[PDB]
Subunit: 283 residues, 4 copies
């Protein structure tokens, strides 16, 4: 059987730290570190110009969706770079990413010094998706690209071979097509090669609570991508309230789970985390 | 340990295909090819002229029922045969019979397929029925069912069946049954060795179930409840061209997920992922 | 793990038997044959004299409950034995069973010619039940005794060694005590020990539909006992979920059992228990 | 996989004891035995001084919660000590426990003759908890200490080596943090270490009925800690889900445990923990 998040629990280990000295910083790329290991999804109802700023200012990052345009989209990302310990570049302008489709229109995004461009679709192990990655690194080599989605160690190596710096893993698609893979097994399948290729992992899908974020990060993911749980908010274009209240609930939940396993940072979190397999009577 | 459709998931493979050159056509017998691998079940609340002509115009096939009295059954096999496509350009259709004299009038409307439809195909009365049909009408294609074992499949094949149909209230009343995914897989090797197509009958609710059944070895899928509320039928689904286009759209999408251009590549490339009880 | 009825399915087999000419009769004891392999439970909402007569008329058997006083229970047995394929004794009277607990009942029940005494207890594998079975057979050797309930092989051996002619295999007790055993595994764990001793088995509990009766019988039990499925009928006590005539409820159960044996290609219960194969179904295989 | 209470069932064994003469007393420490193996949790909606008095009078024990101020908690303990099978100390006064959370409590609570100090926290396998245990044992060596909660054999030995006389094993945790352990496997993972160390185990969490209490004790627990099941009682804090008199609630689970030991054929808790066999049940069995 392939495991999902509800199939396992984190085993409590000896601890000598408190959720006060606990670091949740994650290093996704070479010169790219998030204080909050959370990315916003590329949906029209989620990450806009306002939510992208709220994500960067809270310690994370948001990516701008493709259903604006090429150029009506660059108006959204350039606003983010107009503006505590937020995540911003050497220039001091807040980090931000943008979702792209599969000739490419990344020039107008790179000219605004985009921090990341996201080539994401339903099937990351495609050939037109594979050649879209080499197309972007051939034109803009210094630019960093995240590719997805893939649920296999084979698809991860294909995207890594194409030059992807980060990969994305990950329902109506299960019902309409019958295609899918439980997220926990998919995450663990693609990180044993990604940890040897030096490539970070963004888990996209299956995140319902903050406990699922703890399991995804403990499985080997450097960051999680969240969309539906950031939809009914003020900063987004059901009702959630302020964005900083939602993310603080996730940050606090992730910090408390690390205190259960006795980890002060994410590196040792993934080194001592142990999954207990629970029965169907998991309530 | 016996798997149904909901116990598995198709694993995504590397793909260079896009749902524009995807061939969902399939053969069910010699000189019998359906552009849509979907047949309409033999429910008297489903298949008649309005639905059989619609199933045939969409690229599939319909089975006009035997709940009709015998003279009204052939009178509706006549209604479909006069305006997919046979040798003479007539819209192909099928008809169901029970356990052989009533098949004579069905041959003289030049029906394209006769379905010996019962709930327990692995029985002597069905074996004797298939032998009697191929004796008086050997140029007549016979689909027989329903079975769910390799032994029942070989018994029908040995009796002269050209197509095997594999197939709840029967589970509650009798306690007898078999999960469809395991039933399909237990029959394919006996059917592929004999060159006999398999029609998956029952357990289909979504378009993903059609993709799993075909990937498991089925040459065609027979749906009934999902075509009951349609207009071309005697809830309310609406136009039958829209529900059928959704089925083919979902099948083409999953075949693109595994990287298959046609159905034969689909059945050779597909790999099933066993999913846990919580993985739903 | 231990499996229940919903964990398995009967596999279809080759069949040349038509469901009309299928014999579902069973021999629960020497010179004791039921044309309907169904017994009514000893519950005060199920089996009085009116339902026991209806159970006996349909070819089954009724077990007068012991919530009746000992004098009331004797009067209810008398009303049954004074009233086509009906369960009748050698003198042509309808047969009936009577439930006793673990002196003031067996004697009076024996002289009103009760056909079977049922030592009904939630835990048949106990010293009290073994003493009761021994004392009943010591004083009334010509009286058939069914003991229960047990769920293990060692429990079945204790009742057989105590002299029980029939053993009964069998939720609030699960939640209150945490004790229990899935009925399918309990039946299978007992039938190899029981049939070696020539003792029939009555499956008691877990029967929701006629398909469960087929599985229990195919697993090895000679007869099933149902309770709540007969609670809302006319012959059931009270004046009330109303279920209608008991004959149609029992006709539905016998119809599903005959249709099930047709899928397996069996003509009688012995062939059913020899041809039947179980297919283990997954959690999603509802 | 790791099993919870709903994953297993107790197997029926041969029995020669009636639940009338079944001894459910348990020993949690030296010169500290409870006639009812039940302890009320340290929750503000559960254990008052009134509820703790009702717990000690029924044969159990109460753990005064620590959402009281330290002065309030000392007054609640005073009211219990100054107030049949009741759990009393050498001076004939009702016994009571009190919870602390890792300086201004243990002293004053020792002065009012508290019978047990409970170091209660969500993660007992931590340095702050181990330091709290060793310092209570340093200043108050004659004071019994229960520490928790843990769920592993490793975390159990850390508490025992720190000086804990009783170990506590054990919602919102699994969804907020993704951390947890099924209670049945957690209890069975500690009994080996605790038995060789001579310390008793208190099962805290996952108990919904009296059957879970029997399974927890059969798995090796000396006592269980229930909370929500006593929250809406007469003696519980609040005013008027109302559940009624707590003596009737405790009478129900006391009867459920006794009959569960009758199925296994045990007259005391020790025989219950040796004769008990667990049956793994299917997903369809629940």
């Amino acid at each position: 059987v392939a495991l999902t998040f509800d199939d396992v629990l984190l085993r409590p280990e000896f601890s000598n730290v408190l959720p006060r000295d606990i670091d949740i910083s994650t290093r996704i790329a070479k010169d790219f570190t998030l204080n909050l290991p959370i990315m916003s999804a590329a949906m029209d109802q989620v990450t806009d110009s306002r939510l992208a700023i709220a994500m960067a200012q809270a310690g994370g990052l948001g990516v701008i969706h493709r259903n604006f345009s090429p150029s009506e989209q660059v108006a959204q990302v350039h606003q983010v770079k107009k503006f505590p310990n937020a995540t911003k570049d050497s220039k001091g302008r807040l980090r931000v990413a943008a979702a792209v489709s599969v000739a490419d229109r990344v020039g107008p995004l790179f000219d605004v010094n985009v921090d990341l461009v996201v080539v994401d679709t339903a099937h990351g192990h495609s050939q037109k998706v594979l050649d879209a990655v080499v197309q972007i690194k051939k034109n803009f080599p210094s630019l960093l690209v995240m590719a997805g989605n893939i649920a296999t160690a084979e698809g991860a190596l294909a995207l890594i071979d194409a030059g992807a710096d980060i990969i994305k893993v990950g329902c109506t698609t299960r019902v309409v097509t019958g295609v899918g893979c439980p997220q926990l097994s998919a995450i663990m399948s693609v990180v044993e090669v990604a940890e040897r290729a030096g490539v970070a992992i963004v888990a996209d899908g299956g995140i319902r609570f903050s406990g699922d974020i703890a399991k995804a990060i403990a499985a080997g993911s450097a960051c999680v991508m969240i969309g539906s749980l950031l939809a009914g908010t003020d900063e987004s274009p059901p009702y959630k309230g302020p964005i900083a209240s939602v993310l603080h609930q996730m940050s606090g939940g992730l910090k408390s789970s690390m205190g259960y396993v006795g980890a002060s940072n994410i590196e040792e979190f993934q080194k001592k985390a142990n999954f207990i397999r629970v029965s169907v009577a998991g309530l």
